[PDB]
Amino acid sequence: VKFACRAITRGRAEGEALVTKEYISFLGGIDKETGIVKEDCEIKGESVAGRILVFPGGKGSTVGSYVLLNLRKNGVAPKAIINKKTETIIAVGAAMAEIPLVEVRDEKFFEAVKTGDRVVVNADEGYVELIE
Protein backbone atom coordinates (compact mmCIF):
# COMPACT_ATOMS: atom_id res chain seq x y z
CA VAL A 1 0.00 0.00 0.00
CA LYS A 2 1.20 3.48 -0.90
CA PHE A 3 -0.66 6.46 0.53
CA ALA A 4 -0.73 10.02 -0.77
CA CYS A 5 -0.10 12.65 1.88
CA ARG A 6 0.11 16.43 2.10
CA ALA A 7 3.73 17.42 1.64
CA ILE A 8 5.34 20.48 3.18
CA THR A 9 8.98 19.84 2.35
CA ARG A 10 10.46 17.82 -0.51
CA GLY A 11 13.03 15.10 -1.07
CA ARG A 12 12.82 11.34 -0.66
CA ALA A 13 14.01 9.04 2.11
CA GLU A 14 14.29 5.30 2.65
CA GLY A 15 14.46 3.73 6.09
CA GLU A 16 12.96 1.45 8.69
CA ALA A 17 9.65 2.61 10.09
CA LEU A 18 9.69 3.50 13.77
CA VAL A 19 6.41 4.29 15.49
CA THR A 20 6.60 5.97 18.91
CA LYS A 21 2.82 5.93 19.30
CA GLU A 22 2.57 8.72 21.92
CA TYR A 23 2.14 12.44 21.27
CA ILE A 24 5.75 13.53 21.66
CA SER A 25 6.99 16.79 20.20
CA PHE A 26 10.44 18.21 19.50
CA LEU A 27 10.50 20.00 22.84
CA GLY A 28 13.18 17.42 23.49
CA GLY A 29 12.99 13.66 23.79
CA ILE A 30 16.02 12.99 21.62
CA ASP A 31 19.63 13.58 22.70
CA LYS A 32 20.99 16.49 20.66
CA GLU A 33 24.31 14.83 19.76
CA THR A 34 23.81 11.15 20.53
CA GLY A 35 20.48 10.84 18.72
CA ILE A 36 19.12 8.60 21.46
CA VAL A 37 15.47 8.90 22.48
CA LYS A 38 15.69 9.75 26.16
CA GLU A 39 11.93 10.23 26.35
CA ASP A 40 9.75 7.36 27.51
CA CYS A 41 7.10 5.60 25.44
CA GLU A 42 8.23 2.06 24.68
CA ILE A 43 11.22 2.11 22.33
CA LYS A 44 13.24 4.25 24.73
CA GLY A 45 16.99 3.81 24.46
CA GLU A 46 17.34 3.49 20.69
CA SER A 47 18.59 5.96 18.10
CA VAL A 48 16.57 7.60 15.32
CA ALA A 49 19.67 7.94 13.17
CA GLY A 50 18.72 7.18 9.61
CA ARG A 51 15.30 5.63 10.06
CA ILE A 52 11.73 6.78 9.42
CA LEU A 53 9.74 8.27 12.29
CA VAL A 54 5.95 8.22 12.48
CA PHE A 55 3.98 10.37 14.92
CA PRO A 56 0.25 11.14 15.25
CA GLY A 57 1.06 14.51 16.77
CA GLY A 58 3.05 16.24 19.48
CA LYS A 59 1.93 17.97 22.66
CA GLY A 60 3.15 21.53 23.12
CA SER A 61 5.32 21.86 20.02
CA THR A 62 6.50 25.20 21.35
CA VAL A 63 10.04 24.45 20.20
CA GLY A 64 11.80 22.08 17.82
CA SER A 65 12.67 24.14 14.76
CA TYR A 66 16.32 24.24 15.88
CA VAL A 67 16.82 20.72 17.25
CA LEU A 68 15.95 19.04 13.93
CA LEU A 69 18.88 20.80 12.27
CA ASN A 70 21.29 20.00 15.12
CA LEU A 71 20.42 16.31 14.98
CA ARG A 72 20.78 16.30 11.20
CA LYS A 73 24.27 17.82 11.18
CA ASN A 74 25.22 15.13 13.68
CA GLY A 75 23.72 12.47 11.45
CA VAL A 76 21.58 11.22 14.30
CA ALA A 77 18.35 12.65 12.91
CA PRO A 78 15.50 10.69 11.29
CA LYS A 79 15.49 10.61 7.50
CA ALA A 80 11.80 11.51 7.24
CA ILE A 81 8.81 12.17 9.48
CA ILE A 82 5.14 11.39 8.81
CA ASN A 83 2.45 13.13 10.86
CA LYS A 84 -1.34 13.21 11.01
CA LYS A 85 -1.27 16.76 12.31
CA THR A 86 2.11 18.46 12.09
CA GLU A 87 3.34 21.87 13.22
CA THR A 88 4.75 24.83 11.30
CA ILE A 89 7.82 24.94 13.56
CA ILE A 90 8.46 21.32 12.58
CA ALA A 91 8.13 22.18 8.89
CA VAL A 92 10.73 24.94 9.20
CA GLY A 93 13.20 22.66 10.95
CA ALA A 94 12.58 19.83 8.50
CA ALA A 95 13.11 22.21 5.58
CA MET A 96 16.55 23.23 6.83
CA ALA A 97 17.62 19.73 7.84
CA GLU A 98 16.30 18.19 4.60
CA ILE A 99 13.80 15.95 6.39
CA PRO A 100 10.85 15.14 4.07
CA LEU A 101 7.79 16.08 6.12
CA VAL A 102 4.38 14.88 4.99
CA GLU A 103 1.00 15.03 6.70
CA VAL A 104 -1.37 12.10 6.26
CA ARG A 105 -5.13 12.67 6.45
CA ASP A 106 -6.11 9.01 6.80
CA GLU A 107 -5.72 6.93 9.96
CA LYS A 108 -5.12 3.75 7.93
CA PHE A 109 -1.47 4.71 7.60
CA PHE A 110 -0.97 4.40 11.36
CA GLU A 111 -2.83 1.10 11.41
CA ALA A 112 -0.56 -0.24 8.68
CA VAL A 113 2.76 1.21 9.83
CA LYS A 114 4.48 -0.66 12.64
CA THR A 115 8.02 -0.39 13.96
CA GLY A 116 10.23 -2.69 11.90
CA ASP A 117 9.16 -2.61 8.24
CA ARG A 118 10.16 -0.33 5.37
CA VAL A 119 8.43 2.90 4.37
CA VAL A 120 9.65 4.87 1.37
CA VAL A 121 8.92 8.53 2.00
CA ASN A 122 8.69 10.51 -1.22
CA ALA A 123 7.99 14.14 -0.37
CA ASP A 124 8.72 15.20 -3.94
CA GLU A 125 5.42 13.67 -4.98
CA GLY A 126 3.85 13.52 -1.53
CA TYR A 127 3.66 9.78 -1.09
CA VAL A 128 4.42 7.13 1.51
CA GLU A 129 5.17 3.75 -0.01
CA LEU A 130 4.94 0.87 2.44
CA ILE A 131 7.23 -1.79 1.03
CA GLU A 132 7.02 -5.09 2.80
Protein described:
- There is one protein chain.
- It contains three helices and eight strands; from the N terminus they run ββββαβαβαββ.
- It has helices spanning 67-74, 88-96, 108-112, and strands spanning 2-4, 6-7, 12-19, 52-55, 80-83, 101-103, 118-122, 127-131.
- It has an eight-stranded mixed beta sheet.
- Helix 1 links the parallel strand 4 (52-55) and strand 5 (80-83).
- The longest helix is centred in the C-terminal third of the chain and has 9 residues, at 88-96.
- It starts with a strand and ends with a strand.
Q: How do you describe this structure in short?
A:
The protein contains 3 helices and 8 strands, in the order ββββαβαβαββ. It has helices spanning about 65-75, 90-95, 110, and strands at about 1-5, 5, 10-20, 50-55, 80-85, 100-105, 120, 125-130.
Topology record:
Blueprint: E1 2-4, E2 6-7, E3 12-19, E4 52-55, H1 67-74, E5 80-83, H2 88-96, E6 101-103, H3 108-112, E7 118-122, E8 127-131
Strand content: 25-35%
The helix content is: 10-25%
From the alpha carbons, calculate the radius of gyration and give it in angstroms: 13 Å
Supply the CATH superfamily name.
Phosphohistidine domain
What's the order of the H and E elements? Answer: EEEEHEHEHEE
Provide the domain count: 1
CATH C-level name: Alpha Beta
Question: Any idea of the CATH topology?
Answer: Glucose Oxidase, domain 1
**From the coordinates shown, what is the CATH architecture?**
3-Layer(bba) Sandwich
Q: What structural category characterises the helix and strand content?
A: alpha/beta
Number of strands: 8
State the separation between the terminal residues, measured CA to CA. 9 Å
**Largest β sheet strand count, sense and barrel closure:** 8 strands, mixed
Oligomer: monomer
Describe the strand arrangement of the main beta sheet, using strand numbers. Answer: 1-8-7-3-4-5-6-2
Number of helical regions: 3
CA-based shape = globular
Subunit structure: Heterodimer composed of a large subunit (PMDh-L) and a small subunit (PMDh-S).
EC number: 4.2.1.182
Family: Belongs to the AcnX type II small subunit family.
Protein name: Phosphomevalonate dehydratase small subunit
